[PDB]
Symmetry: D2
Subunit: 261 residues, 4 copies
Amino acid sequence: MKYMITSKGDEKSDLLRLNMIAGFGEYDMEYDDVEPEIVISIGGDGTFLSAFHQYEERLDEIAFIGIHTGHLGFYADWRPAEADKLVKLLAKGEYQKVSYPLLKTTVKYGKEATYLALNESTVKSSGGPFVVDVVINDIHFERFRGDGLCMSTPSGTTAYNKSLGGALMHPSIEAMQLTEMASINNRVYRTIGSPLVFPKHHVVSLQPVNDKDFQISVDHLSILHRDVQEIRYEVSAKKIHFARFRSFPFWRRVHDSFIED
Amino acid sequence: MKYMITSKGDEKSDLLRLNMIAGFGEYDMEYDDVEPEIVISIGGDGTFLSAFHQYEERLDEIAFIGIHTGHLGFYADWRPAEADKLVKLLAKGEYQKVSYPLLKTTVKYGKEATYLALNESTVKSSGGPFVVDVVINDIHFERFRGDGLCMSTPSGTTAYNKSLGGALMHPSIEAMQLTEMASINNRVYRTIGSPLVFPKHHVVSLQPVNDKDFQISVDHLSILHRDVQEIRYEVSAKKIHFARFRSFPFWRRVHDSFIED
Amino acid sequence: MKYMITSKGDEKSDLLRLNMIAGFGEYDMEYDDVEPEIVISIGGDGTFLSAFHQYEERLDEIAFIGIHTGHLGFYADWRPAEADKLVKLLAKGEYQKVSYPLLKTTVKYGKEATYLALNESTVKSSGGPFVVDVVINDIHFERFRGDGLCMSTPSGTTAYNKSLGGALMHPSIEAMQLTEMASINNRVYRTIGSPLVFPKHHVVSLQPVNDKDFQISVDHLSILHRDVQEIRYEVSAKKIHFARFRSFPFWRRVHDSFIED
Amino acid sequence: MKYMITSKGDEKSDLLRLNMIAGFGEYDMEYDDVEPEIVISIGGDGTFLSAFHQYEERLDEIAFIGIHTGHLGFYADWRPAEADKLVKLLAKGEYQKVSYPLLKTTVKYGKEATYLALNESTVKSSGGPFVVDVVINDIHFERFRGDGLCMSTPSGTTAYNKSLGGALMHPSIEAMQLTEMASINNRVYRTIGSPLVFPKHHVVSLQPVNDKDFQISVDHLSILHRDVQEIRYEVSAKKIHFARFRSFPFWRRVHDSFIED
Ligand SMILES: Nc1ncnc2c1ncn2[C@@H]1O[C@H](CN2CC#Cc3nc4c(N)ncnc4n3[C@@H]3O[C@H](CNC(=O)NCCNC(=O)C2)[C@@H](O)[C@H]3O)[C@@H](O)[C@H]1O
Ligand SMILES: Nc1ncnc2c1ncn2[C@@H]1O[C@H](CN2CC#Cc3nc4c(N)ncnc4n3[C@@H]3O[C@H](CNC(=O)NCCNC(=O)C2)[C@@H](O)[C@H]3O)[C@@H](O)[C@H]1O
Ligand SMILES: Nc1ncnc2c1ncn2[C@@H]1O[C@H](CN2CC#Cc3nc4c(N)ncnc4n3[C@@H]3O[C@H](CNC(=O)NCCNC(=O)C2)[C@@H](O)[C@H]3O)[C@@H](O)[C@H]1O
Ligand SMILES: Nc1ncnc2c1ncn2[C@@H]1O[C@H](CN2CC#Cc3nc4c(N)ncnc4n3[C@@H]3O[C@H](CNC(=O)NCCNC(=O)C2)[C@@H](O)[C@H]3O)[C@@H](O)[C@H]1O
């Protein structure tokens, strides 16, 4: 159907994109980057992230495919040499779609802004000390003092979540995971420490205690928010759809990226 | 209906059991510890664990209730002073049942033995070095060298799993979580490090590399197994049912047990 | 001899300062905040830190004493009710001095600036990704990718170092300790992970790989540095001297601050 | 002078030993495994550990050298191909000696046994729960509940200590480091969590609370001790001496063993 291709912008990725476009010209494939049904990302995981946010308002109409030009990307699971075979299989169709959960961040002021994340959503202070009350389904759970917090999707658990001590979570689990960044823990201040895994329909809310300015980052897009009254986290109802042409299981993907390949 | 009561065995718990029995005599409640429909545990989490394994062959016919005589137990969420009010509400009935996932361990030899866990199932070596290949859905994932491994249920994540760096997982998530015990990690030997969370129908298998003798512990019941060929982990199809009479959410339970109460 | 007193600035601390000054008027004690020999800090650990940096150019001529107005501070080990007994013992003299090691940070450009730390010296990126080569005594040790790094004094190991997984180190050990902040670790990027403890005369140097702008914080005083060519860490030759009037051992101080008091 | 050579016992190591002996026959070198002045270990770190304990009663009269037949050992820093050049340099002499601190474990009963460790000394329970009071210089510091504890030398910090979260410590620092094994931490039971680094002349003592049987392991030599009244740890006055023929710094050794080589 309709398709488009984003590139990292370097020489290698642009040429691959041009060759794939020329290969798509030899089928009934129309290039359309306004209402594509197939979005192809050529680059790394960052490039795939940019492609996701570029089309986040049409997630139900789009299937994503990643090609990695450098080393294996977690979302870009195709080597450049397989691009010709990918063009052919994609042209025919009859591929199966695979869906991963997403995370919804809502920021309220004193107005409401919402964001969608594929990796994670983190919160820090705008300079001063970060102090927030953590409220789970309207129950006050803890007062957090430290560098910040990170709320991860399942496919995000192998990213920033992993470096903060979080657990790696299979993407068929509709959940989100909260991890701490350097929390204070003494006789006066104490947090849970452990990562927390939340199911669908649970709401985690952050409430300022003193400072109301926070730096919020959704998939490394970092925005300063002033006069913040609440940050709410929940598993989104929207999902990202991947076009898959062969078996590449998640735990094998994890093995290749972290153990050996 | 039919019911029975287990006690920690100390003076305080025995007297509470006797008083509850006398209180049950004033209703249409028959004491039966062969085919009870209600099992009451008076003691700590250990006592509740013993009650679970005592009746693990009738989990679908039984609802559990825990009373804690010492401090708050995670499974024993009733104070002794509320025992009279518990007798009354239980006598009427019309309570709602709450189900938690369980973990199935299978041990093969050179014959098959299976176990059911409510907290976790761990594996260590019988003295020599512990070395196992970790296989996920028939895919070889890693070779583990270290002290041992721990596979946790959701309600178990606040137990041994928590002390090994695992994530705390809400019990409505049908999953199991694998955590490492002091793994070797240098240029020659390397593991994933991070905890792993597996959904229903995923099978994690441990395969010996050299030594075939392992000490396997299911809910602190520790058994030596010789001539072991495989240990398989998967989320059980069986579930434990709790009788609940009021709202005591999991994250509030976690807050009380770890933050403050 | 000569003395001065810094206060947190709230009502409670100002009144305590005024009362101690009036008590010092009844001895041969001259108030002098230009060349004091005794510096008294009334507040928390932050107030003590400010007092240290206010007089860092006369460390060999000054002994410090901390009074904590809120909860126990690690450096402020005197309760306000003991202020009168402290005035008396200090007026007589014949107290013993205790010395803690300090950390020297040197920043080079493309010029040289040096800083002295009592808790720690940390480095982050000015927004972009933080990537530095870590060089130990002119040996290239690792390339670090992550949120940042923290170099701690011994008395600092119970502060930020503690929240990043570092070890707690007795202050009689002339050393410094380096800990990571959320490092990337996969098949392509890998760091040591473990904290590193360095003796006197060892030099740890950070060298930029791409971005040359870093946010450097010495005892929570955070400064942006542009066009950075090198950050060098080493145990200082200067030491801070505490006046002590009774036995309050470090591990007891640690017990009171973290286990129970 | 006098010398002897221990081998791992496999074919490769025995032949190397025989060739080195024949090479030593061509100098004024007498083979003597009763009172050697030079001890050569051919194998891995385990083989070097066995050589250390074989001659622990003559540490001041002996210099050690390790040759690694498999991958790089931390104590065995010579490749087999350099054995001929090692024979020659050792025959001449005029080499410089390098000393590493050691750890002294003392076990008291209801009699006294002492052990010397080069890597570490650990303590576990003989089956039941491990519960000990931790006393630092006669000050009660904490009650530990968990799997066990590990007290490490500096050169041991890259071994078991590393896998338990401890810090890596340069061997010129006369110290010992204590790390936890899976400690219980909730509202009722709490430990320090962080590793602890102790200087020379500090004494750490473990005192049983209930069970008095402990499994104590000194450099992987594991002994059951019954009727235990106290386990005392302190930096030994004895030191191990290494013969060094060229610069191979500790942090380079660490880089090669963990980052890349
Ligand atoms: N302190 C920290 N430690 C560890 N990770 C941290 C971190 N701070 C942020 N992040 C993670 O970077 C994401 C944003 N960036 C693109 C990516 C993607 C990714 N997504 C996944 C996934 N789902 N699973 C497995 N690997 C994944 N990756 C892998 O990360 C490696 C690069 N990481 C870097 O940090 N660069 C420096 C700053 N970031 C960027 O400029 C752009 C690449 O190898 C890439 O392939 C965020 O969304 C965070 O998650
Ligand atoms: N090194 C280690 N560190 C941390 N935990 C470890 C551990 N080794 C094993 N275990 C856990 O003990 C369970 C078995 N025992 C009864 C319990 C239950 C429990 N279940 C839950 C739950 N689901 N959620 C939250 N808290 C829970 N608890 C809390 O543990 C505290 C006691 N722990 C102890 O270890 N005693 C010493 C040895 N064990 C026993 O004799 C009996 C009590 O406070 C009890 O209330 C196992 O199944 C493991 O999980
Ligand atoms: N993410 C993080 N997690 C943990 N600590 C972090 C951190 N970021 C920074 N720091 C540490 O704060 C120091 C600077 N601040 C005064 C202090 C002193 C201190 N010194 C010691 C010591 N030597 N030993 C034991 N406790 C000590 N304390 C204890 O820290 C508690 C407050 N901590 C806070 O963070 N406030 C928010 C930001 N900071 C400030 O505004 C002022 C007080 O209880 C105080 O008594 C820095 O130098 C860092 O070390
Ligand atoms: N759960 C655990 N996780 C991590 N380490 C653990 C551990 N349990 C115990 N140990 C450490 O094994 C030592 C005893 N063994 C010889 C060694 C030496 C060593 N010494 C050093 C040093 N100073 N610095 C850096 N590396 C060093 N090594 C490296 O350890 C690798 C093997 N480790 C193994 O465990 N084998 C299984 C059991 N042990 C043995 O049969 C024999 C080899 O690569 C060897 O070269 C102990 O003394 C402990 O320290």
